[PDB]
Every structure is written in structure tokens, then in C-alpha cells.
Amino acid sequence: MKKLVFTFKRIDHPAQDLAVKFHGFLMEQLDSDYVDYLHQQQTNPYATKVIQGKENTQWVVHLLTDDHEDKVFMTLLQIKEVSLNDLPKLSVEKVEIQELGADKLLEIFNSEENQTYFSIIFETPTGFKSQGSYVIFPSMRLIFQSLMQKYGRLVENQPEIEEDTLDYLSEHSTITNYRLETSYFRVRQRIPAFRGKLTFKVQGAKTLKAYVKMLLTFGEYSGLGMKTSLGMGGIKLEE
Amino acid sequence: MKKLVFTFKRIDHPAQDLAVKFHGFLMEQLDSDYVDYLHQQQTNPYATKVIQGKENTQWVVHLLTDDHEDKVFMTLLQIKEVSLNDLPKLSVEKVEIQELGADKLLEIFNSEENQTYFSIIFETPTGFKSQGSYVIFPSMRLIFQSLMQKYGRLVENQPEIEEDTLDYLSEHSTITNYRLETSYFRVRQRIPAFRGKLTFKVQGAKTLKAYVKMLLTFGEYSGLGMKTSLGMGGIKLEE
Ligand SMILES: [Ca+2]
Ligand SMILES: [Ca+2]
User: What GO molecular function annotations does the UniProt record carry, in alphabetical order (chains A, B)?
Assistant: First the structure.
């Protein structure tokens, strides 16, 4: 999987609305026939983010599958100038490239440092769709389910996940600390979501805790929950 | 009901631990035989708070019943100097007195201004005991239940509440916004609790919304949830 970070001179505009606009610009680069293909799965092979800085603005694009990477990676590198609505033509100052393959993930598993406590940071508005209406309070079952689904569909090409494992992961995980707040994401239907940081503990074998760490490490690329392609659900597993 | 606010020169000490210490000092003033009586109900006729300020420290004591007020009110007024463990002898600079009776509550009901949105501020660590273990994420059912129980036991002398009303109040209330964080209260067993602010909307008749406003206004005195007498569950309904 690939992680591309486009750096612009600091853009004075509400970050959440850039993410939606950047997503539109991104679609205008791909073959329209290929775009319609992306609209026919529960999970897209890409996730985007927008991080505002003190002196810069960063557009993050995650390539999550090899097939998607094969047809898109070169195109994204050619990008030097971006033009969005109501905004002056943007110039790409830098482009960073990081990669996350099986070698790094498997390394995470057999690590000498096995974590019991895990701190998740919700950089962008994160939401879940459960039992009809939306969700404003995150739960471990919803977090693990979204990641297990995203992982199963993208790298294993399997429609459904192991419910016993989801039960097992939820029974042994418990939120201990959090600092959260509401944050609505505009797609223009306002979508309810949350933002901030939480901490949970895992009680069990080191083989279990390793799977959690891997699932979270993978999550930093795919994003967590709803509308990850539009800029939602950007997470970060702190050291 | 009475609201006494004791003002000291700013005390350099963790506010949550003062609340526990002040509670001990408060018990050392009452008849030991009368103290044992307080330990024999699910709800105490008093609630305490500790609010840290920039230049002052405020000790709040709520008298919730007439009988408790009759035997305690005069004693609390005589207090000019307070001595707690590991602390220099404290001197009472001021003492403020406010009252909340049926006249103010009934006034709240027939108000010309009927609220749909309600913002609750959790000044001190608030916790609920539900289905065995504790609770870190507040819910409208837990909030209304605690207040309905506290109100029913204190002014109506009724052991249980109307479950249909609790169902009715929960079905029509919905959290829309919040800014919350974990905050453990030390009683020394660490008790998990939350802190901050939330906002919920009420969908229904004005008679329903008036009952909610009254219940919340009453809640500013009794406190919300667990261990209100020890300094927990101090709330504030903003204008
Ligand atoms: Ca990381
Ligand atoms: Ca008030």
C-alpha cells in the first residue's frame, strides 16, 4: 500500500471542505469508465485526508490495493498544479511517498514490544453507520468491525468477516480514557461524527494484542469507519 | 432547598481531594447518631461541590430537604475556620446563600421561553452505576433516571419512579453535540467518571420540555449520578 502526501502552501479554507473538493479533483483525473467501477463496492481501494498545519496544508492519498496502485500511482505523481472551485490555482510544493506492505505488518506482529494499552487519535471526523441511524460515541466493536471489514475486502477479497473473532476482540477490549467531541462532516447533507482521542486496554494473549496492533497499523492507511475516501475517519496510532 | 457557597482564599490543592476532605469535616460537625442515619438511604439529603477559581476556592453545600435544613443550616453558618489534613487552617472569607423552592420550579414550568435544546455542563466528575460496572459515556436514559430517582426520593418520599415516563423522556431526547473527557474520582478506590459538556434536543409537546427544564434546574442542586455528597456529579444548566 502507498501513502502520498501532497504539500501546498497553507490554504486558507475549511479543511473538511477541501477534502471533498480534492476528492472531486481526484476523480477528474481518472477514466470515467473506471470511476463508475469504484462506485460498485462497499469499500473503495483508496482513502484521503486533509491535515492543516501552521505553515502548510497537506493532502494525503492512500493507495490500498496493488491493482488500484498500478493504474493510478503514476498519474498522481504528475500532479503539480491543482485547481478547485472558489480557490486560486494551487501549486504542489512537495510530494512524499511512504509504503506499507506485508513485511512491515508481519514485523509489527512478532515485535519485541507487545502493547496492552492502545491510544487512537481521530484526526478527521469519524463516523459509524450502525442499526439504522449514525453514531456519535465510538465503541470497540464498531472500531474493530470497520477495520476487519476494510481489511477483509481489500487484501483478502472476502465479503464477510469472522464474527467469532469480532466477538473475541470486543470481549477483551475496554475503553479506559478518552477526550472526544462532536464534529459534523458536510458531504450538502450534514453527517454526524466525532473527533479526538481515546485509549483502550486489551486483556489476553500476546497473539491477540499483536493482531490488534496490526489491525490498527493497517487502519492508519485505510481510515476508520464512514466515507474514508471523502476525508473522514483519518486515524493515527501513536507510539 | 438551600445553596451555601463558602469562599476561601485560593487553596493550592487538587480540588477533587478537597471535596472528599470537606465532606469529612462536614461530618465532624453533625451528631454521630444522626450521621449513621444518613448512611441508611440510597440518596442523601445533601450534595457538595468544590469549584476552583483564578483567585478563589469555593466550597458548595446543597441542602435538599426541609428536615435536613432544619437541623444543619444554622450549624453551617457558624463555620468561620476549617481545618483539613495536610493543610493550613482555612479561613472562611464569605458565605453566600441561595434558595430553590416550589415557587421557582413552578415558574420554570409555565415559562414564556420553552427550550427545545438543552446544554448540560459537568463541572465535577460525573459517573453512573449501570448493569454492574461503571459508565464513562453519558446517556439520556441514565441522566433522566438519576434525576427522577433523586427527585422522587427527596421531595415526594417515593422509592421508585414512573418507568413509562422514563421511557417517554428517553424516546424523545437525543444527544446532538458534546465535548467530553474521562476524569477519575478518588474516594482510595479510583472511580471512573466523565467531564465536560453535552447538548441534547427534545421532540414533543411544551409540557414535556417544561418537565425536562424543571428536572434539570432541580439537578443543579441535587447533583447528577454517583456520589453527589462526596463532590461528584456537579452539573450546571446554562442559560
Ligand atoms: Ca504511525
Ligand atoms: Ca443556573
Answer: endonuclease activity; RNA binding
